[PDB]
Design a protein around this ligand. Sequence first.
Ligand SMILES: Nc1ncnc2c1ncn2[C@@H]1O[C@H](COP(=O)(O)OP(=O)(O)NP(=O)(O)O)[C@@H](O)[C@H]1O
Ligand SMILES: Nc1ncnc2c1ncn2[C@@H]1O[C@H](COP(=O)(O)OP(=O)(O)NP(=O)(O)O)[C@@H](O)[C@H]1O
Ligand SMILES: [Mg+2]
Lengths: 169, 279, 261, 278
Amino acid sequence: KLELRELVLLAMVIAIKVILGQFKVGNATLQVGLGFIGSVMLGYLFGPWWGFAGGALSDLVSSVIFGNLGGFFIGFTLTAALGPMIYGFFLYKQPIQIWRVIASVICVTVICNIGLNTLWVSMMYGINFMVALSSRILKEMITPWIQMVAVWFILEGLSRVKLSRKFWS
Amino acid sequence: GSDNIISFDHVTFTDSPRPALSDLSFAIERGSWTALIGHNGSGKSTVSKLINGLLAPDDLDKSSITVDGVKLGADTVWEVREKVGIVFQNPDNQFVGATVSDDVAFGLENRAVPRPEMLKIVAQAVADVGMADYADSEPSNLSGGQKQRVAIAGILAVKPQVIILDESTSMLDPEGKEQILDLVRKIKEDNNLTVISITHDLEEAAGADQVLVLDDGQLLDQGKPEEIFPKVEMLKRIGLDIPFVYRLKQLLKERGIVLPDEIDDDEKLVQSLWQLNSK
Amino acid sequence: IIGRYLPGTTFVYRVDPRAKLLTTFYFIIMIFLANNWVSYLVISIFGLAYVFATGLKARVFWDGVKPMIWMIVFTSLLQTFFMAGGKVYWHWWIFTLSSEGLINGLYVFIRFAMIILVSTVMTVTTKPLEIADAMEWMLTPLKLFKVNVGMISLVISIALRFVPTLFDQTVKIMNAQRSRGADFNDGGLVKRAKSVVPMLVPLFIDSLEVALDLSTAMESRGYKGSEGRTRYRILEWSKVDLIPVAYCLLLTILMITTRKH
Amino acid sequence: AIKFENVSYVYSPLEAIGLDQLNFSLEEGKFIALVGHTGSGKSTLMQHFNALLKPTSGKIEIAGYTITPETGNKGLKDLRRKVSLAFQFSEAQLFENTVLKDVEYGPRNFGFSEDEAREAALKWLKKVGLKDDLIEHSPFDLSGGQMRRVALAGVLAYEPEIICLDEPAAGLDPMGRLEMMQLFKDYQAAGHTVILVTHNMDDVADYADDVLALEHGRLIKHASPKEVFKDSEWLQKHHLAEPRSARFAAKLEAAGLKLPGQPLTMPELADAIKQSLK
Ligand SMILES: Nc1ncnc2c1ncn2[C@@H]1O[C@H](COP(=O)(O)OP(=O)(O)NP(=O)(O)O)[C@@H](O)[C@H]1O
Ligand SMILES: Nc1ncnc2c1ncn2[C@@H]1O[C@H](COP(=O)(O)OP(=O)(O)NP(=O)(O)O)[C@@H](O)[C@H]1O
Ligand SMILES: [Mg+2]
């Protein structure tokens, strides 16, 4: 159901998500990767059902080029493809709303960053679930308070672009 | 012999108020370098996309686009697109393959050519454009000239009969422009193709066998390049940079030296000035 | 920053990328299946044999360990403190060291080291296009679900080819915006979040332009569909591909007997 | 007065000499133009003006500030205020909602008051020839020749003094190219240096006062264009081009027209031809 222009645009957005996984924001005290921004684009433009494929291929390409230094695994691909699905479900074509972005980031953090990524880490490294959860609870509890602003401004920018003559449909 | 014929056209894009191409009628002789010149946004790339069936006229009942004796229709675009190849403006946007000598194989892949034939055809096609030493090199390690050379190789692999240079050399160093124009003319002479070059530049079109001027989606004037440029008023009024020789002749006429309109190109002017000084 | 291939001559470089990728997935699977101390000794022996076979200097592996060394030590210490049993050694209010805790910390650091070593040997010792072809081949089983794998292969190829070009475009865009006077790291949270729109929006519009131009190019060269198209780059099995599988099988046999089972 | 002292940038197995020993002192208020073949490191030298890069071992004296290899990124928001760079495809940096807000996004970063920034943006859109009613349209909804003009009015609104332009008129129509070049040639008249980087050589012959020739990352010649295009053998040896008028004059000298002076521009060449025929 995707015309060839939209497939090439999906490849473009996957490449942008791969790139944005390396540009960090912050200082020596706290650094947040910008990879999440890629997700929201894959959630905002193409929707969830193609957002899943976008995320999976984004993780595959990131493993190919920049190297999956965390160990090749399918669970990590699932977690990298289960973010854009939620983002699309929440804000695919519905108008801009603050409650939508807040709920989206909270739901992705509860489902992807915690709850499933921690499960994969626990399974791979053989540690107990509580140990893995307490090892990365700090960053997965601090990050959403920054994501819910960065995603808001990114979504504002995308909504501004989509109303121009550049975007065909 | 008219290889390419376009009858009355309307290519109103979809939505926009004014048509992008009004009634446009022209023909291209086989083997003749025909150059389109028009103002920025006058509707040239739309003609390029119409030729190879990528778009279509809206009024299909009285619109004709004949290519090599094959009319353009709904069940024929995939045949006409085989014998017409376009080199687009951006050197790196159109580079689809992962590497050179893998991009040149895209045109053959799209036609299901067996691999034993592909492994020789791509090698020969890369050899024609002189990029032999750079086969299997990543796109980011090439300049604009090499990327355009590999795109020319790619559209030559399928062995087309029309090469439409859609402003191919409008993003390069003049040395690169000269090199690529020399390469394209060499390929045209060797393989006996027909080239249509779309250029805002006039020096490139100064050597064309024919010149077609587009203004606001209409065919303003048409003819040989030695009888189209001398009417400088038209080229000035539509916003085109007049070639150097004609601008110099206009300056001399302003200063008070009158020379024949037959005096085209540079060495003719040099000789005429020499005889005028010798008096 | 882009690409991590390091050329050489050793036989691991001649192993077909699909066989190597399957071996890495299988090693990751068989890491789970090891509990007893002699089983982790077997894991260590096999991982170190593979590492000494790939013939690489230790500095690339150290470069692969440095980014995530802090997480390694944090998780190992958490595992040591969480599980206690046997000798108590040094003690505190709640921080109870133990021989069981110490060996569990070592046996989780072993898993870290082996996963990192095998993944680094994959990423270093094969070209990116080879990994792309390996994954496009491994996605074959999806043909049974009627989903189209030609589209997925095309999308992977285009994204992989456009990652470096878009990276250069992104850094150029940031350079231009910084020359205009933008500050991309200072000013608090609201400023740091507002200063990502200039990074993205021109990049997104350039992506729209590139997508339209490339779609027009591929449509003009005859891309009717992903079905009915031969291939230029192919992967052919060799005799040296018998080396992984014979290795890859042998490991399994040991974990049938060596563990507690 | 811009001064460079042993400035040299280098990119590891990929150590490349992107720039070598440079020794030049550019004056203030002169239309300096950079020339060189492709891959001669014109952009690497260009990016040293606002300290986007930093010399590996050398010293830069730019607009009164000193740049050294160890200088940090803190404190440059008062240098990039006095040195503004317009990259090759400037139109690919527009992002804001309206053209006016995009133009005033420049001055707003440099402490300009909102009313002052808006008035400056209005003035510099009026000067670059953009239409009066085109101010509030979306920047993405314009043509190429108007996106370029908005971008040029963006990196030039806060009145910088050492502006550097990487081909500001790469893809404009001849009327637009003439308008932009006249705008810059008039901008320097107020006392601001307009360092330019163009492969094209006709406008450099017409406007520029100083020419910086770069060969493979090293400065080779630095003088007026009247003293650079004197012999074609040197230019052809070092890959540099030549303005069309000079080439035509050299070709005409073969027939023996003994042209007085040294023509470089089309009106100058025409006047020389007219004076010769007497
Ligand atoms: N996708 C489009 N949607 C609507 N209008 C368009 C589209 N593409 C082009 N146009 C308009 O149609 C006319 C002809 O377009 P086009 O032929 O692409 O101009 P152009 O001459 O190719 N620009 P250039 O490449 O710089 O010479 C112009 O008025 C364009 O603004
Ligand atoms: N970060 C860098 N620093 C220095 N040199 C670089 C860098 N990246 C690439 N180079 C190389 O340095 C040489 C000069 O680079 P560059 O300054 O871009 O030339 P250039 O001619 O000014 N580019 P262009 O504007 O298209 O003419 C080339 O061989 C580049 O490949
Ligand atoms: Mg440049």
